[PDB]
Amino acid sequence: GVMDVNTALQEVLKTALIHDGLARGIREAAKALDKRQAHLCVLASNCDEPMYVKLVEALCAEHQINLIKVDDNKKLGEWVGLCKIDREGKPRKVVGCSCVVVKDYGKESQAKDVIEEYFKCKK
């Protein structure tokens, strides 16, 4: 609860890579929910395709997925690690995907104290 909730999706998507629980992509992200084991999913607001959000929210609605609203496509993809970092720490080429799903949470308490508490008040 010490940190902001839109900057609290950092470490859960870091630990989404330690088991490769981040089903990166869109078709793979669509089939991630088709087997019904994903815990959380987020979405980028920057979409050229308006009906794409209607596709993904249809599966996020009836299969009990809670969502976090993030504004930018290319900002969202760096939590996978898809940005090509330089030797001094600059992302000289960033890949952004608008469907980031998770399959396993991290092993801590500093992540689910703010994300899940922000999830309980929208119920």
Partner: peptide
Amino acid sequence: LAVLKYYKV
């Protein structure tokens, strides 16, 4: 993102 050719809502 050719799932739009598959999925219709």
